[PDB]
Amino acid sequence: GMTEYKLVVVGAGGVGKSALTIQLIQNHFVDEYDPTIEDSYRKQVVIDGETCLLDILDTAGQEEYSAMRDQYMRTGEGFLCVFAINNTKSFEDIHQYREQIKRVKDSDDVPMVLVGNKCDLAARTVESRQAQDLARSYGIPYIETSAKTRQGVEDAFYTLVREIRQH
Amino acid sequence: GMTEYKLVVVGAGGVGKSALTIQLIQNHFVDEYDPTIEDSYRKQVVIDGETCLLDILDTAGQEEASAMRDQYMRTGEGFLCVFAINNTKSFEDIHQYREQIKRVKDSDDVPMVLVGNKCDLAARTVESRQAQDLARSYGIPYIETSAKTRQGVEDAFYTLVREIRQH
Amino acid sequence: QMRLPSADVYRFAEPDSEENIIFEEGIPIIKAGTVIKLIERLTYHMYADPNFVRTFLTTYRSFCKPQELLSLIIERFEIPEPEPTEADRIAIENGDQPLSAELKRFRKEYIQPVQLRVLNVCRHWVEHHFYDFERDAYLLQRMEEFIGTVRGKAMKKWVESITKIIQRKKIAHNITFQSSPPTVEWHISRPGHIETFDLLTLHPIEIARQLTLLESDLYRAVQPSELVGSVWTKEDKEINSPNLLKMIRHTTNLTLWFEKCIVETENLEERVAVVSRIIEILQVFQELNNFNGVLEVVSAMNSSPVYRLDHTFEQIPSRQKKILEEAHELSEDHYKKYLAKLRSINPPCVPFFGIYLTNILKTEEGNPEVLKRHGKELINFSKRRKVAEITGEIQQYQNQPYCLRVESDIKRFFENLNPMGNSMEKEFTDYLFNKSLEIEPRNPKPLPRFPKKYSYPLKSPGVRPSNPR
Ligand SMILES: Nc1nc2c(ncn2[C@@H]2O[C@H](COP(=O)(O)OP(=O)(O)NP(=O)(O)O)[C@@H](O)[C@H]2O)c(=O)[nH]1
Ligand SMILES: Fc1ccc(CN2C3=NCCCN3c3ccccc32)cc1
Ligand SMILES: [Mg+2]
Predict the structure, then answer these.
(1) Which of A17, B140, C174, C297 is the most exposed place for a label (fewest CB within 10 A)?
(2) Which positions ≥6 away from B104 have C-beta within 8 Å?
(3) What residues have CB less than 8 Å from A124, skipping those under 6 apart?
């Protein structure tokens, strides 16, 4: 009964979305990387004692292909909506990503997580309070990660899996 | 999957090694004479039902690079021996190239094709019968080509591939 | 062996150690090194490595400025000759002339290969990466001065050649084919009558051909300078990646135009003819190896407004469901089948650029700029080789031209397509979806009826070409 979950990362480009999945799948004690090789987006993990397989889709770099977003999102059971804490615009776009996900999945209750991502040392413009409140108004978990120290990265994905399992 | 083949083009200065290669690669006739030092090209192509990845090395013909040949002849799997049909000196030079390749690769059995380029021209000084005679003494095919009209170009390059394949 | 210059009048003769160069576990492959060592290997005396030259010139700007590169190559170029040997001294002492054997061997086996390789880097630099010089006229000046003051007749040929080449690139291409391109095909719209041109009135064979030509040119035009350093994703992306972006925006346009042709065709029968014709166009895309085209169509079918039109899907002929489903399967499992088919076909083809973009991006964000070893900071060169492997695969498909005639009017028609008009994206995207809801409402609401909008026959001429004499 090895369950596979199809997770899809979405969010503004140009602000380190990419690091979230890279740090996860990497192991992460290593620091070299090849996205080219197959099963560099597959990852077996043990969440709450039950083992499962994570299949992450991260199309970072393809954001200008805006008409492909439905094609991509349609494939997923769970979603990470990522913004950068030093980019207010990426935070304001979170609404349009959520509405767009609800539409392609044709549901008002799609398992999703809001992730706030620290990509560098430029000042925070989105406090965690605001992000918490948005995430509460949607009835979804909020998780902050660091694009450097791998903090909160496991928490992000595992929470989304918990959100799928308890849907 | 696709087999990879390392081809190499040798011959005197000005015979048209570069024009032949660029014609094969880009369907374009280079009319400028810009002496080569060493250029590398890649070409995926289906030959006799099989997908090949051709690596083509365009080598220097100028006398001043006489001492830099062994390195590239060590790597190549098959050799296009080019002379111009309007230049008898370049045809007498073919013997040297053949002997060199044989020495460097330590085999009497290296895949090669003899190529008489510039066949679009009227002013021919090397006759086919001679080149052919030479090719038979080598046990290899003779193919006449024009980088300008594209006559023979694919036939010379793909024949060489077949010889590597049957080797 | 041979003696290298003194390591104090020439920085490029320091012995290799794991403090300045690290190799990968017939020529060796560099994992990491200093810039001195990277440039030395770039122009090594023992062997040529044209792949290293392309990799380096494509990617060096993340670790070394252009002005600095040119200075280092110029430095590498001025190799000190050795002093007269003991035997040379003894001959001169006796009025005779030296054999100068060691000196002549040093010239022929170190200096000459190293200098030519330097000149080869300059040649590839100028001929394939001329933008460093377009964006910095001083750098161009320095380069012309260097090349122009190179004395020595073993170099003369290439010095003169490289001088002309630089001059050409400053103040600045036709094609030959094995066969003749097929006759341009016409359906309802006849030549000249561009006012009638539209999805169903042009020949589906000729829609595919001309979109494929157009999309091939857009693909062929993107240079690695638009990709290296992830610049298409940054704030100056419009400045740095204008061809990549033009290409993507065309793909988006076409995908929305497909969505729009469909959902604005309110009569069911008419809309089915529309979808079926788009699937026929997709079919000629597959024949033509235009994978960008294939996925423009597949993205359109999978979009929110179109995917939900169950009544329409239901009437698509079986053989065309099959074609659409096969194309859609190219995209499954992180493009597994697409990648295998792309690596399988006989070019010309038009790849989907999005996979390449994501790979370059992750390679760059997933690998460190430097490796720290023995307290030294080595350039992580394998990282740059990975990016260059990708830009090389891209360039490999940019070489082959399609054997197809341009039709000026049809080409201008597709260039000028502007489905969104003056509307922003969410406004237009919401419009398309409402059209989808109007023409095939959610259950339990009943299916309305709608009048024909097309006055011309809906029958497809088919996707098999024809041949008069
Ligand atoms: N008529 C004609 N001219 C040709 C042909 N091939 C090459 N040329 C011309 O002959 C000249 C030399 O071509 P080129 O390919 O540069 O020769 P090369 O073998 O590369 N020389 P090098 O050894 O210096 O690199 C150019 O002016 C080119 O246009 C051919 O088939 N026909
Ligand atoms: F006229 C059309 C054509 C397609 C559609 C949407 N659609 C697909 N697109 C890609 C392949 C599989 N696929 C479907 C399967 C089952 C139902 C709808 C489907 C909707 C109306
Ligand atoms: Mg040449």
Answers:
(1) C174
(2) B69, B70, B73, B74
(3) A85, A86, A118
What's the per-residue H, E or C state across A1-69? CCEEEEEEEEECCCCCCCHHHHHHHHCCCCCCCCCCCCCCCEEEEEECCEEEEEEEEECCCCCCCHHHH
DSSP states of C389-449: HHHHHHHHTTSPPP-----HHHHHHHHT--TTTT--HHHHHHHHHHHHHHHSPPTTS----
Task: Identify the experimental approach.
Answer: X-ray
What domains does chain B contain, in order, with CATH numbers?
Answer: 1-167 (3.40.50.300)
The residues facing A146 across adjacent strands are: A118
Neighbours of C69 (CB within 10 A): 21
In chain C, how long is the greatest CA-to-CA distance?
Answer: 114
Report the alpha-carbon distance of residue C251 to residue C247 in Å, rounded: 7
Angle subtended at Cα C381 by Cα C379 and Cα C382, rounded to the nearest 5 degrees: 140
Task: Pick the residue from chain C with its C-alpha nearest to B61.
Answer: C157
H helices of C264-290, in order, are 268-287
Spell out which residues line ligand 2, taking CB within 6 angstroms.
Answer: C 275, 301-302, 306-307, 309, 312-313, 316, 324-325, 328
> Is A108 annotated to bind ligand?
no
Chain C residues lying within 8 Å of B45, measured CB to CB: 346-347
Nearest-CA distance C200 → chain B (Å)? 34
Domains of chain C: 3-170+354-396 (1.20.870.10), 182-353+397-466 (1.10.840.10)
- Residue pair B83/B90 in contact (Cβ under 8 Å)? The answer is yes
Q: Which is nearest to C263 in space by CA: C274, C252, C250, C254? A: C274
Q: Select from B27, B35, B68 the Cβ nearest to the Cβ of C48.
A: B68
**Contact present, A160 and A120 (Cβ < 8 Å):** no
Q: Which amino acid, residue C236?
A: D
> Do residues C386 and C41 make contact, with C-beta atoms less than 8 angstroms apart?
no
Contact B56, B40 (CB under 8 A): yes
Owner of token pair 């696709």: B2
* Chain B environment of C175 (Cβ under 8 Å): 27-28
Separation of alpha carbons C27 and C460, rounded Å: 58
**Quick check: A56 contacting C, CB < 8 Å?**
no
Resolution number, Å: 2.5
Q: Find all residues with CB under 8 Å of C13, minimum gap 6, and list them.
A: C4, C5, C6, C7
Whole-number Å distance, alpha carbon C19 to ligand 2 midpoint, is 59
3-class state of residue B55 by DSSP: strand
Token pair belonging to B44: 């995926």
Give me the residue label for tokens 């670790």. Answer: C63
Paired tokens of C228: 């290296």
CB C78 within 8 A of CB C50: no
What's the CA-to-centroid distance between C64 and ligand 2, angstroms?
51
